[model samples]
Target: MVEIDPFEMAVKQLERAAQYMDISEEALEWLKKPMRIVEVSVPIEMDDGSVKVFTGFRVQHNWARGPTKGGIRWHPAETLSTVKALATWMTWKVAVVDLPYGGGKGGIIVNPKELSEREQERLARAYIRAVYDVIGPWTDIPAPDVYTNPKIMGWMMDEYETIMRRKGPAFGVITGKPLSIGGSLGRGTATAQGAIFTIREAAKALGIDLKGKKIAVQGYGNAGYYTAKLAKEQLGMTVVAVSDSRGGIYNPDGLDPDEVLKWKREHGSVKDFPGATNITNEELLELEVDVLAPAAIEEVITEKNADNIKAKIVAEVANGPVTPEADDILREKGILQIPDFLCNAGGVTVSYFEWVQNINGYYWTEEEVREKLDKKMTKAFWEVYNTHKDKNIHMRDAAYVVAVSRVYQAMKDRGWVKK
Candidate 1:
């Protein structure tokens, strides 16, 4: 069932959203499936002078809105099913934010941490080489995800540019590059900042102030760390607990994000941060806090623990954090949950900005980029909120309604589907 399968969960969510509005069976069929998936063999030379071949996948879920866009994840568990599910979510993500792009995602089945930096670069470049023809300035643009980052994106971009022997408009073919290259100024914190924007708006809409409200973050990675730093600094929330893959740390008075982050950086885990008590990731989820941001992986909140979520607001900084069954439990409990697609659209929004700058040969200051992002996220939150209110459905379903409707409209207008 949808309980253990990511792709099945995505399809179930689409079906739930279809229940709220008028959508054709054909459109649901299109939305539930990916358009194309390209598998490639990325052979890289290791530092030991041996070559190893890795499997890579790029799944373009939907492109009726515009060009496909998503990130490249490099993880040992990168399955075609996971990539397909992420690609499907990316389509709704862009559409919920109303960006003129479709959903796509790519990944290589390897643990990048086991490889040297040079070997990782070769893998990235080789994967790009294998799929270069299917991706371009207007076809499929890739960015950084999971284990991939700016340096990897730069390597892939360089390989594509090297293959095309061009420089002017070719840069638009990839995003999340280093600032010295073509990365947007606010790209790094875009995801967290975008979630914080929604949190602020949600606080207002809920008639509550965030000052001194406790926060429990269930992940301490890029998005999780920034969520702690920004929510405390910008919204005056007390970060009571935070966890990484190893474990979690907590301080009732509040854990300083900088100190905990430095400890994690130096010691490689948040479990033993000085002056904080250790807690399990499961325990952290049930903590009594004003905001609970699950910035970790998917399916953390399942049917087993959904009823235990005590926070007034659950900001899903990570993709698919809550299962559809758990979504029902939370709704029954009246927890104001900000759906993932709308909550985490900031990264893609800034990626869109980076693509625009690349195509125009113009870049904006960090302040301008942030201002633009704020505008986009704020509008997106309200759009989904309004839909939820008018449609009288769960927020995630409302988001899917908004997103799937946009794609359905585009596909219909393009004459790909009949009404």
Candidate 2:
């Protein structure tokens, strides 16, 4: 078993939310466990003339609201527990955003970087072949997650089509498909753009002028990179430091977000980008900045290092990046921390929009999409922010309370199992 299981974190969060709401054990237990957990063994043929057996999992946490929706991640270190936790998190994330959908997540345990394009396609096809019967536009829809992008979504969508014996309006089966295949414009930047809405709210509550505000981002991927760009262009925030898993670089004078993205795309990491001092990922988190964005993996800001966080505000773009134990330290230190679900919900928020467009067969322009995303994320942020202040609880729990309440209401309305 993994040393620290995500499902444990999820259940703990769920129990606390239930307590906050005074919900009975009968209702809480049913919501805690997933409605469906499908594990499949994927046997793939490698490009090197070898056969490999991998594991794939999909957990549908709830369906009272609608068909389950979540991302598909491909990682070598993915665990069944992590998938369960993420799927649970997805349940709450959608609720907080007020979407008409429940939560589910899928993952395949394999290092995608090791596979050639051909082998990667084969693996994706195999993954769908293992889970097609239960996955449909009206049943379950999977989007792109970590290490999985539009290209991979296209492959999965195609495989689902092949399994169905024809192309049956595949645009509805997946959200994050390539533009050529009906993917909505502005979907690429949805996560970061939605985060910008929350950041805007945080700035208002603190009475801080985010204009030229110093910020450090601890991830340079899609969400992290676009977050930096929008913060600078839209909010006038300054980027002082940014890093990826390999490492990061710092320029107190502020690095151009677009330039950094160009460098990262060419060099595969931001370690040795021109005109910046090299810094470790640990150093990036501990940097004294106005805003610290945890855009990378989880547990980077646990109790061990939470006290050392010097940012005036912390926004978690990554799920569970701050452990429950660390929530107190940040709050006690007077650092306003935006919880993960609200802070990083932009991706899923926009994904909901894409699903709406697909179902309705009408798409919005880029400007219209951004406007709708901004409004939805703005409302979601204030809901959590106001609730946190009113309840005098940790932001994470406040978010959990709001999210769990919504899910619970759906469960009761649908009349799910009592025990």
Candidate 3:
């Protein structure tokens, strides 16, 4: 078996989507590569009075529709190809949700947890200064993802403001910030709430009631925690199992999402949550459940385990959690796996709302934000679902058709591609 690069996976997925549509060769050729890529080296001052240089990248996938929008993640495994792939996914995601934005992503290759609080802040500011020339409110808006969070976004946004020697609408340069800053009301939980909205629609289409149905979530990060919290609270679903990088905990009777989170915080892992069984990430994925959501990393559901999946629906909360090969296998098994871009687009959707509020000098209440988010997620879900039913193709392919066609049309309308 050969390993597939993340960028290759993205392009392959695009080619698959192109096969089901009448995309022009010119558009395909241009869309195959990004419009701009900025690779930077950040030299940060460590708390130990040591100078360290870190590698970072910001890839802008497209700008025909509008300014690029994506998240900035900090992890030891960050790579240029991974950033480019995520940027491409962001392009389609904003299009799928019909947001007026292109796609961009930035990442620094280091574990923020290993650094002191001071070092982490310095790193965030340093990365911003490194890529400061390429990103802005109207150029590319960065948000939080992976190891990054709202505090980090706040620091980055503040850094950008300091460099620009001004503030106000410029706050839109970065989102997912603290409420005192410019973060939206529901932006923190938007990704999970967005996934839940789609799952609600999926249940309606499949005639399945989500209430009391079991859900196993792989990944206990920001998105995963909220996923378990929302599904269990909003939809009355049972989170039977959940896993972090360390391990997972399963309880057939039931598991308290918040309690599990508390256990994780105290014990450093979910492995010993009281009265629960410990399980591997693999076992958690294979658990018989109503919905299986992989919210952590990419390529967890490859062809190797797609056939063994027992869930009725696979809500991809993370980007590219399902491989191209796994998509075929899962589709063959009659499993409804929502594509990553469509499923996990809630964060970006709300980030757009934050940008709007920031520029307009107004803010929306949490209720207003949630209502608006539900509307967009529901609409996007049906758009992809209808395309799947009409074309008899996989859900991911359908998402690609709907999302890519919009982007292609934007490129053509903007005179970037042959009209």
Candidate 4:
């Protein structure tokens, strides 16, 4: 098994897209590397009454379009390359959605679950202090990713405001914060909502009805749950299988999203649910279904298993879910794939909404937010789909072409590069 460096994967995808467009070498080189990379050492007192140092990173991949925007991941496996890769993807993700922002990401190398509530607050605040100079409402705005959440974002926003001595609603500094502190109304389910929007478009394009379609959702996290829930509630799809890190449960007769979530909440895993057979995550991936959502993590759909995928559409609710190699295989197999950045862009899109609301001090109702999101997501899906057909390329490559071309044009228009 080849160990995939996500940054390298990102670069490779860009290089492939360059073949289809008139991307200049200078622009390509500029986009290939980060504009700024901050490596900080955070020293915090542990619950055991000892001081420990943890490494953290914030990578600003590019800022040619506008301010950089992305999430901060706090995980034991955080690495500079991963942050760089995520930032790189953010540039394209933002561009794909036509948001006036670039890309940046941050991460801390620690398991946040192992920290006490007080320690978590300290760590969140410490992260803000370490990267305060580089981040701002007009610079690089960070949100929640991986083990981080709105509470962590709230702490970070509070820390940033405290550092700047800003008063009266400085919540613009971070997104995914609590609703009382300026989070968007639909921010929680934005990613899945966005993905389902694209899935609906794809179903229409394929001339297939979503009603009663069998769906399998891999990874029972936030995105996974919403993907399953929304597909069932809104699209009327039968989600036959869903899996978490431990394993999965399957039912040929379909499983109710609410019941599965409740059982998981009580049991701490989606496995061993009543009336469903236990299965491995690998088995869930290969199950025959109309839609397969890879919402767990990256590199799950590699070359080894791409041929075995039986889904009509592979909706990537997670970033970089399919390796480039597997993407080619799926494309050849005629599996309509809604690429990650485009498929899961709802979170950032709504984050952009939250930022706009905070800056303008006007918030919209949840219905209003969802309506606007539906319009934006639906339009973006068609743009990508049309580009996919016009360019005669894979959906992933088509998305890269569409997004990178936009970023490349922005760089040229700003005179950052010569034509």
lDDT of every model, 2 decimals: 0.85, 0.84, 0.84, 0.85
Q: Give the number of colliding residue pairs in candidate 3.
A: 0
Q: What residue pairs are clashing in model 4?
A: none
Off by over 4 Å in 3: 1-6, 39-56, 73-79, 108-133, 238-253, 262-284, 302-305
Give me the overall lDDT of model 2: 0.84
User: Per-residue alpha-carbon lDDT of model 3 for 1-419, expressed as tens digits?
Assistant: 89889999889878877889998788888988998998988999977688999998889989999999888888898888888988887888899989999988888888877899888888888888888889888988887778887777788887888899895467788777888876678766777888888889898999996769998888889888888888877889877888899888777887788877677778878887778877799888887888888888899888777778898888888867878778777887778988877887877788889899988888889889988888998988888999989979888778888998888888888888874
Q: For candidate 1, what is the TM-score?
A: 0.87
What lDDT score goes with residue 169 in model 4?
50
**Could you tell me the lDDT of residue 303 within candidate 2?**
88
Kindly report the root-mean-square deviation of model 1 from the true structure over all alpha carbons.
Answer: 3.1
RMSD of each: 3.1, 3.4, 3.4, 3.0
Candidate 3 displacement at residue 349 in angstroms: 1.3
Among residues 3 or more apart in sequence or in different chains, the pairs in candidate 2 whose N, CA or C atoms overlap within 3 Å are 191-347, 212-236
- TM-score of each candidate? 0.87, 0.86, 0.85, 0.88
TM-score of 4: 0.88
Q: What is candidate 1's lDDT per residue for 250-364, written digit by digit as tens? A: 7889878887767777886876777977779988888888888887889898899887888898888877788878878889786899987778878788889999999889889
Give the per-residue lDDT of model 2 (tens digit) for 84-188.
Answer: 988887888888989988899998888877788999989989988888878998899998878987888888888877777764666789998888877888876
Pairs clashing within candidate 3 = none
